[PDB]
Design an enzyme around this catalytic site. Structure first.
Site, PDB file in Angstrom:
ATOM      1  N   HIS B  88       0.856  -1.187   0.000  1.00 46.42           N
ATOM      2  CA  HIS B  88       0.000   0.000   0.000  1.00 46.42           C
ATOM      3  C   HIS B  88       0.888   1.232   0.000  1.00 46.42           C
ATOM      4  CE1 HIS B  88      -3.530  -2.495   0.921  1.00 46.42           C
ATOM      5  NE2 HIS B  88      -2.769  -3.126   1.801  1.00 46.42           N
ATOM      6  N   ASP B  91      -1.460   8.772  -1.194  1.00 45.63           N
ATOM      7  CA  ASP B  91      -1.458   9.936  -2.103  1.00 45.63           C
ATOM      8  C   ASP B  91      -2.343  10.978  -1.408  1.00 45.63           C
ATOM      9  OD1 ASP B  91      -2.312  11.850  -4.102  1.00 45.63           O
ATOM     10  OD2 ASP B  91      -2.671  10.295  -5.600  1.00 45.63           O
ATOM     11  N   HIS B  93      -4.013  14.453  -1.955  1.00 43.14           N
ATOM     12  CA  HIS B  93      -4.328  15.554  -2.869  1.00 43.14           C
ATOM     13  C   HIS B  93      -3.937  16.928  -2.315  1.00 43.14           C
ATOM     14  CE1 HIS B  93      -7.616  13.334  -5.388  1.00 43.14           C
ATOM     15  NE2 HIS B  93      -6.483  12.656  -5.295  1.00 43.14           N
ATOM     16  N   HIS B 128      -5.762   8.953  -0.514  1.00 49.86           N
ATOM     17  CA  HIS B 128      -6.125   7.578  -0.865  1.00 49.86           C
ATOM     18  C   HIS B 128      -4.893   6.772  -1.202  1.00 49.86           C
ATOM     19  CE1 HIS B 128      -5.596   8.050  -5.281  1.00 49.86           C
ATOM     20  NE2 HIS B 128      -6.143   9.241  -5.131  1.00 49.86           N
ATOM     21  N   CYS B 129      -5.034   5.453  -1.114  1.00 50.75           N
ATOM     22  CA  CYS B 129      -3.958   4.541  -1.509  1.00 50.75           C
ATOM     23  C   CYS B 129      -3.877   4.559  -3.032  1.00 50.75           C
ATOM     24  CB  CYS B 129      -4.293   3.136  -1.016  1.00 50.75           C
ATOM     25  SG  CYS B 129      -2.953   2.007  -1.272  1.00 50.75           S
ATOM     26  N   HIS B 138      -7.644  -0.491  -5.061  1.00 50.62           N
ATOM     27  CA  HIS B 138      -7.425  -0.096  -3.657  1.00 50.62           C
ATOM     28  C   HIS B 138      -8.379   1.018  -3.194  1.00 50.62           C
ATOM     29  CE1 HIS B 138      -3.582  -2.335  -2.525  1.00 50.62           C
ATOM     30  NE2 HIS B 138      -3.911  -2.768  -3.731  1.00 50.62           N
ATOM     31  N   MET B 143      -9.903   2.454   0.519  1.00 56.34           N
ATOM     32  CA  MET B 143      -8.722   3.193   1.013  1.00 56.34           C
ATOM     33  C   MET B 143      -8.715   4.678   0.654  1.00 56.34           C
ATOM     34  SD  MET B 143      -5.672   0.403   1.020  1.00 56.34           S
ATOM     35  CE  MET B 143      -4.803   1.455   2.166  1.00 56.34           C
ATOM     36  N   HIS B 248     -27.428  16.179  -0.379  1.00 61.72           N
ATOM     37  CA  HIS B 248     -28.629  16.975  -0.120  1.00 61.72           C
ATOM     38  C   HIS B 248     -29.045  16.650   1.313  1.00 61.72           C
ATOM     39  CE1 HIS B 248     -32.769  18.575  -0.839  1.00 61.72           C
ATOM     40  NE2 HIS B 248     -33.108  17.592  -0.026  1.00 61.72           N
ATOM     41  N   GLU B 272     -29.754  23.638  -2.418  1.00 62.63           N
ATOM     42  CA  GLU B 272     -30.588  22.456  -2.120  1.00 62.63           C
ATOM     43  C   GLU B 272     -29.720  21.199  -2.226  1.00 62.63           C
ATOM     44  OE1 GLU B 272     -33.820  21.870  -5.174  1.00 62.63           O
ATOM     45  OE2 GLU B 272     -32.654  23.266  -6.396  1.00 62.63           O
ATOM     46  N   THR B 273     -28.977  21.112  -3.320  1.00 69.75           N
ATOM     47  CA  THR B 273     -28.127  19.967  -3.605  1.00 69.75           C
ATOM     48  C   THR B 273     -26.815  20.483  -4.152  1.00 69.75           C
ATOM     49  OG1 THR B 273     -30.082  18.655  -4.119  1.00 69.75           O
ATOM     50  CG2 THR B 273     -27.943  17.853  -5.012  1.00 69.75           C
ATOM     51  N   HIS B 299     -28.518  12.710  -3.892  1.00 70.16           N
ATOM     52  CA  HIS B 299     -29.826  12.940  -4.540  1.00 70.16           C
ATOM     53  C   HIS B 299     -30.002  12.347  -5.949  1.00 70.16           C
ATOM     54  CE1 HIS B 299     -33.907  14.472  -4.948  1.00 70.16           C
ATOM     55  NE2 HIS B 299     -33.854  15.026  -3.746  1.00 70.16           N
TER      56      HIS B 299
HETATM   57 CU    CU Z   1      -3.791   0.055  -0.685  1.00 70.53          CU
HETATM   58 CU    CU Z   2      -6.333  10.870  -6.354  1.00 68.47          CU
HETATM   59 CU    CU Z   3     -35.479  15.819  -2.807  1.00 70.55          CU
END
Ligand code: CU
Ligand code: CU
Ligand code: CU
Ligand code: HEM
Ligand code: CU
Ligand code: CU
Ligand code: CU
Lengths: 81, 334, 334, 334
Positions: B88, B91, B93, B128-129, B138, B143, B248, B272-273, B299
């Site tokens: 594993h 990463d 971001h 994330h892995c 993964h 992950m 939502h 709303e969303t 939603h």
């Molecule tokens: Cu992994």
């Molecule tokens: Cu990524």
């Molecule tokens: Cu709705």
């Protein structure tokens, strides 16, 4: 003659690392990479798979029996010829 | 220079909670030390006994949320116990260089590594892995998690007015790709690696079998519902490392939302969303004005109600008739 | 106090029209009274005679658009005639509390209820039916529409300049999930309840069989095309209660667009294509500069041309050679 | 009056390069002349030998990027050589009227046409073929690219501060719908027409068989990887004429991003992942801070790593330990 159980195992599990070369795993079909392994012979390769080696977990991370693992090793060797 | 800075060790907490932090702080930059231990495990992901051969940071889907402030350095020790089967890495971001740290954190079972990076950009960021050659597997297997990098003087509205939350919750949404056998039943696998081949087949259809908050259908419901009170302001952090979602709050709104999750941009109000792009985390503030049970969901209502992408928030307090009143209860048509 | 406020009654009109309103108003807040009657009915949704066992507010897909102003109260009487089979309710995304009003408006056939809520947030907001345990089916079968809450002062650009439209159109986009039989033909059902099980299976594939504007393939074309003229400013309200869409006007633009649909946020300008999150309504302004027949569509072009998510706008007026000129008409290569 | 304006001629270049241009300019409006020639051809879209019956502007997927400035007129000569089988045209999202020019550029094999339009709105805009009744097929087969209309004063941040790039790259992302035969292998067709019926069936599933940058799995790798240096600012133009995508630079960010692609709107900063709506082009600036090989990808990681939507940027320069440092290399757990 190969057994279908080998390829099936390969496609279910081993492929995750050996398709590309995850953690420098020798890629399926890589003729040059596999030449030294072919020269070690099938029994030695099978022993390595059972034990695990580096980033390859024991039994290639499967619960397959020795015969099925032998068959998967055989499929891998075949692809490199 | 990071080496000259005070070092602080933070103890992580399991989702949906977030470890205690400061919002606005008078402190200057520091090195904030965290540890996570990878755990591969088979997990039951629905009401019908379906299992996932899962992979996690710290035993949870999502991994825990890590909070620092803009200009802090994150120093993560990543542990891969010998009990695991796969290599594993991680990463972030929120980080700059080396594929988010992935190139520097490659750990085989039985190994660990320590990465430091400067969190010089404010916002909620996915981590994330990402092991080279097997990245999507993964991620979809569990992950991922969120790094939250708060501005040093806290969140602000588009006019620069201070925004403060009383509590933060973290929701990780996971699109799952569980294979079926020819009998039409979900497959159960003896080992993690044995699940791969059939799982990639399902992945390639781009159609999840399940889409779940925090690791299972109903994870954030019943006894495990989120909670709030009228007057309380909550921050809802929502991560989706692989696929788009559209959060939502039923009966509520996003009062201030950073849907792309980056705090140097003005938030939008009255949503709303909102929309969380696959591979990101966003954040929404809401101040409750009504008691009752709310649903917090994706939603696409099929994804929410059929596939699992829904949770609840149980809210205490006084009902407000000005905001909403039942004028005539259901009764026979005259 | 909402009681004591003046009441007004508004007569709704069928999509794609929107009932006469005020934009900027001198009026103070009022309680605006609406009635809607639910109609379950079989509807032909394509030109091959395929049917949908549909459920609608007021006999149409989408239901009618309700317009008030920020600070008004919406007071809706919801009627479920005894001729219907299913219980229904209404969830207003514009509302605060009680799952958007759904908990307060559970009406069985032969029943009605009256709900009031404060429209305290400006924007276009989805409303839809949401009966417990049955939400996705009721929504995808047709039970959604738009509530438009205009700022009291009218629409404004990013610099606070007034924006004004000459006519409003409302478009509801509906992802449909029509089952097929062993012969590969769409199934036709005697009754609504009959369609339930098969439809849920199609829904779970996340793949619509049809995606239609306003209840059927080609609803907004031919004699039923939208109309405008050069110099006219049109508001295009676009709702999608379940699934994302990406509106585009072929040969035009979104001059000013609130894609998340909330008017207190500044709009974006010059858009080629915008994005309506599943579970939301957004709005775009455009002033026509060229005559001719435009297409208005979802710019997943498969969704538009193969599945049905496209309409037309026929525009009168004088061609502008400054904006576009055919220098050489198609002719043989020398 | 565009008659009377001076004309200039541009030599187009193939993606990912973009023809040399001015950002800020002292020139006033001009009529900028471009020629593109349609090429239908069978293309190999992976390293395995899989083929697509493709259709292209100028021999490439995407077609070349055309750069003018706001207020310029674009004058395109579109040629459809006799060698081709199908009628074609062009729809510019940056143009106003006549379906983006499509009604005025219908060219059968052995015909050409010349269209002029005013580029009066700044931004990156999709152009694509749109033959009546055949639109989706032509687009998904490769017929799209980007028109970039720069502000005459160059790009600006949200406070109106100048933003400059050292190089621009253009990435067109293509969702492909390649049929499979009974042997589970992708079908190979002898002619373009022979591929039509089977391709339409795949399209209706809404599931791409492949998603590629610039016409091929791994197109932007090796000798055709994007390149830069530490300290260099790149503009990454990303077009998707048919389907949503979510660009992400692994180990980097979008320093300034116009995800809807329209330069008169303020950009967002510090993005991890942005969103390009199907039927649009967007643009991101980033200044490299670390050397190494970055991945630039669609952050639906299945779409990226399984289906092909991923490329590389190779970056020269000196590593920065302040931004990221391996504190402890992978080693056994104590
Ligand atoms: Cu992994
Ligand atoms: Cu990524
Ligand atoms: Cu709705
Ligand atoms: C039952 C399934 C598997 C089979 C049959 C198999 C087969 C083999 C064979 C025959 C070798 C050569 C032995 C040698 O290097 O001397 C090898 C090496 C290797 N395999 Fe596998 N493998 C399987 C699973 C896996 C998996 C799941 C991984 C990834 C977690 C993996 C990664 C590697 C690596 C990294 C090496 C090189 C070891 C080193 O030199 O450090 N293998 N495998
Ligand atoms: Cu209903
Ligand atoms: Cu064409
Ligand atoms: Cu278009």
């Amino acid at each position: 003659q190969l057994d279908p159980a080998g390829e099936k195992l390969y496609r279910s599990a081993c492929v995750v690392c050996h398709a590309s070369g995850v953690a420098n795993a020798p890629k399926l079909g890589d003729k040059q990479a596999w030449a030294p392994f072919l020269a070690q012979g099938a029994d030695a390769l099978l022993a390595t798979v059972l034990k695990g080696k580096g980033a390859m977990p024991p039994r290639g991370g499967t619960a397959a029996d020795e015969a099925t693992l032998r068959a998967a090793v055989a499929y891998m060797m075949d692809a490199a010829r | 220079d990071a080496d000259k800075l005070p070092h602080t060790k933070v103890t992580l907490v399991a989702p949906p909670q977030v470890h205690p932090h400061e919002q606005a702080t008078k402190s200057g930059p520091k090195v904030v030390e965290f540890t996570m231990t990878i755990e591969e495990k088979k997990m039951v992901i629905d009401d019908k006994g379906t299992t996932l051969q899962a992979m996690t940071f710290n035993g949870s889907m999502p991994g825990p949320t890590l909070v620092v402030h803009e200009g802090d350095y994150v120093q993560l020790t990543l542990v891969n116990p010998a009990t695991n089967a796969m290599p594993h890495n991680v990463d972030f971001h929120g980080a700059t260089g080396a594929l988010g740290g992935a190139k520097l954190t490659n750990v085989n079972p039985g190994e660990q590594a320590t990465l430091r990076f400067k969190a010089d950009r404010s916002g909620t960021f996915v981590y994330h892995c990402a092991p080279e050659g097997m990245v999507p597997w993964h991620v979809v297997s569990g992950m991922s998690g969120t790094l939250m990098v708060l501005p040093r003087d806290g969140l602000k509205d588009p006019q620069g007015k201070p925004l403060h939350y009383d509590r933060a919750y973290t929701i990780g949404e996971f699109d799952l790709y569980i294979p079926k056998g020819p009998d039409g039943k979900y497959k159960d696998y003896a080992t993690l690696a044995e699940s791969y081949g059939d799982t990639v087949q399902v992945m390639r259809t781009l159609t999840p079998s399940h889409i779940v908050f925090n690791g299972k259908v109903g994870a954030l419901t019943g006894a495990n519902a989120l909670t709030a009170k009228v007057g309380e302001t909550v921050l809802l952090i929502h991560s989706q490392a692989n696929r788009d979602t559209r959060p939502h709050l039923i009966g509520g709104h996003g009062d201030w939302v950073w849907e792309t999750g980056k705090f140097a941009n003005p938030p939008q109000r009255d949503l709303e969303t909102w929309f969380i792009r696959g591979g990101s985390a966003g954040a929404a503030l809401y101040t409750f004005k009504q008691p009752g049970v709310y649903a917090y969901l994706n939603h696409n209502l099929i994804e929410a109600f059929e596939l699992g992408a829904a949770g609840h928030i149980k809210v205490e307090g006084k009902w407000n008739d000005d905001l909403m009143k039942q004028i005539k209860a259901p009764a026979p048509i005259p």
